Every structure is written in structure tokens, then in C-alpha cells.
């Protein structure tokens, strides 16, 4: 079954958000956790991963991946598996069996791919409709190495173009009013908000956590929509 | 790792101006979130201003007080114009770094470094 679109005032507002949007656009800018062929060093509570992958800027930083159930995380363990998605360190807790801020250390949900067999041998493009207020005015695409992608990934690579070449989140708040991304395969879609909740905080944990079911698209098949609204 | 130096304190009669510095060393501002707090006798720190887009200011403060940094003197600036007696004051410098990937806004218990603070007094 398809998730159906946005409700009337279902999508949160831009104006309602009145904390720094630096909050989510550091979330969707070139910083973010990319590791290949990596096998899990740890498993944390029942529903996460411990990886260690290289920090390039130091040598070895620890990744806590969070699922959404055991499944999930019992399922990867044990795998080699590639690790994509947007990281976070404020209030990022965990150990290896309220702690420190620590740039060794930092916390994201999903974006766990099996690697083995997942390999395409060219780059694949998705092709981006971005509609202003109803209007299709722009249109690129977004490319990926796997026959097998999470829609984390693509969602950061959509954002990531949008933020360098539309402004999507800026320092403060950003020129769109609403947002939404959604993912179409087959006749079968669902969509993620792109805006933060209302109030003065951002609490960039419980916006990620949506990712946390490691939910997956073809690369082949999928479709990416964008939907903003201006000020 | 970075060490904050504030000047520029003194007294002014109400509807002037006057200008505080920051001087950073150990590590580039550019690194750092900065940010300007001031501390009213009588009140908690409260925030004036953050660098980042076209700057963010408290409402108190919005149309009268800009904040800069110059990258190359490593430095802080809060320029404060129309100055009231409501903003009699310690005004502090801080940093938050960067590679967090977090701004505090003006959450001052969040940040790492402070200068020593600066009077600023304010006679109408």
C-alpha cells in the first residue's frame, strides 16, 4: 500500500520554526557519514551497530547506527555492508558495552546497504521533478553505485543540490515555506517533510529517527519528487 | 584551543555608540560558532548576537547593534549604536566549535570558551 500525500496543514511551516535552521542545514550539507565494505565492530542496546570508519580530517571515528527494531540490527551484524546517511554529535550518547561531546564519536540512524552484490558496474541517475508552488521548473538528478539504495541516501543527495543551488536551509530560516520529498516505485510512494517542527529548538535525533527503518528503493526503478512552497 | 581576549568596554551617554572587540588565538575563528552574551546586574546571561547569514540579534537589540568578524585579525566585533541605559552590562564572547555540527543559539551553558567580559555602562 501508498502512502497518501500531504494532508491540508499536514506539512510543518518553515515561519512556525523560530530556532536556527543551521540546525537541519548542517544535516544536508557536505558533511556526512559515507563508509564502504565495513563490518559492524559492536553491537549497542538491542537495535544498534557500532562501525568504525576512517575520520580522513584523524585516523578512526566510531558510528553508532540506530534501526528501528532487533531485526534489523541482527540482520547486519554479521555482514559487510556500506553505511550512508546524515550524522549527528549533540546529545549523541553510546558506549561499546549524558556523557562528553566527542568528535570521535556520533550517532545516525538506517543507511545500511548489504555490499556484497550491490555493486553497479557505471554510476546510475535518478532523475529530481522539483515543483515551486505547483510549478516544475527544475529538474536534475542525484547518482548512486547501488542496485539497492536507502532512501536516506537519495534524500541527502536531493537536499544536499538543493541547499548548494536553491537555498533550501540557510543560516536562519530558509525562502521555502513547506517541503516535502517523495519517492515513487511502481504506483507506490512516500514522502518525508523537509521542514523542522514548530518551536524555538531543533532536535536533530527525533527528525533522523524517521530513517531508522532502513527503508529501501531499486535505484532502477525509483522516481524523486520535490514539492516547495514560497514565502 | 581557542582563547578569547575582550576590550573595548567604557562608559557612554545614552544615543551614542561604541565598539568591543574580540581577539581569538589558537585556532581560527572561522572554526568556531561565535556568539556575543551580556550579563545585567540582576539578570542571567542573556544573548545579543550570533554570526552566521546577515547575523542574528535578540529583538532588544535588532536594528541597533551589528556583530563581524574579520577573519584575518582573527577577531570579534560588536558594534552597538543608539546605546540605552538597559544595555549597561558585562558583555562575554564565545565559541562553539563547529565540527559538532550544532549551534546552540543562545543556549550559553552549550559553549566551550569565553573571554574575560567587558563593562559596558551606559548613563542617560
Known amino acids: ?231 | 584551543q581557542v582563547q578569547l581576549v575582550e576590550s573595548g568596554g567604557g562608559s557612554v551617554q545614552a544615543g551614542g555608540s561604541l565598539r568591543l572587540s574580540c581577539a581569538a588565538s589558537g585556532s581560527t575563528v572561522s572554526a568556531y560558532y561565535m556568539a556575543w552574551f551580556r550579563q545585567a546586574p540582576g539578570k542571567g546571561r542573556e544573548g545579543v548576537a550570533v554570526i552566521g547569514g546577515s547575523g542574528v540579534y535578540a529583538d532588544a537589540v535588532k536594528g541597533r547593534f551589528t556583530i563581524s568578524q574579520d577573519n584575518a585579525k582573527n577577531t570579534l566585533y560588536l558594534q552597538m549604536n543608539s546605546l540605552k541605559p538597559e544595555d549597561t552590562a558585562m558583555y562575554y564572547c564565545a565559541a562553539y566549535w563547529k565540527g559538532y555540527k550544532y549551534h546552540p543559539k543562545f543556549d550559553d551553558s552549550a559553549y566551550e570558551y569565553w573571554g574575560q567580559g567587558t563593562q559596558v555602562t551606559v548613563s542617560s
Open chain 1, 1 to 231: 500500500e501508498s502512502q497518501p500525500d500531504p494532508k491540508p496543514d499536514e506539512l510543518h511551516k518553515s515561519s512556525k520554526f523560530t530556532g536556527l535552521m543551521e540546525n537541519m542545514k548542517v544535516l544536508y550539507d557536505d558533511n556526512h557519514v559515507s563508509a564502504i565494505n565495513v563490518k559492524s565492530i559492536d553491537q549497542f542496546l538491542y537495535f544498534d551497530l557500532i562501525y568504525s570508519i576512517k575520520d580522513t580530517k584523524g585516523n578512526y571515528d566510531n558510528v553508532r547506527v540506530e534501526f528501528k527494531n532487533k531485526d534489523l540490527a541482527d540482520k547486519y551484524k554479521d555482514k559487510y555492508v556500506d553505511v550512508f546517511g546524515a550524522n549527528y554529535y549533540y546529545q549523541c550518547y553510546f558506549s561499546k558495552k549524558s556523557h562528553q561531546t566527542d568528535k570521535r564519536k556520533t550517532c545516525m540512524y538506517g543507511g545500511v546497504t548489504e555490499h556484497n552484490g550491490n555493486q553497479l558496474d557505471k554510476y546510475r541517475s535518478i532523475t529530481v521533478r522539483v515543483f515551486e508552488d505547483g510549478k516544475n521548473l527544475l529538474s536534475f538528478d542525484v547518482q548512486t553505485n547501488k542496485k539497492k539504495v536507502t532512501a536516506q541516501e537519495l534524500d541527502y543527495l536531493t537536499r544536499h543540490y538543493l541547499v548548494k543551488n536553491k537555498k533550501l536551509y540557510e543560516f536562519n530560516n530558509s525562502p521555502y515555506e513547506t517541503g516535502y520529498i517523495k519517492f515513487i516505485e511502481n504506483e507506490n510512494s512516500f514522502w518525508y517533510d523537509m521542514m523542522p517542527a514548530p518551536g524555538d529548538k531543533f532536535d536533530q535525533s527525533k527528525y533522523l529517527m524517521m530513517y531508522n527503518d532502513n527503508k529501501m528503493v531499486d535505484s532502477k526503478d525509483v522516481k524523486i519528487e520535490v514539492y516547495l512552497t514560497t514565502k
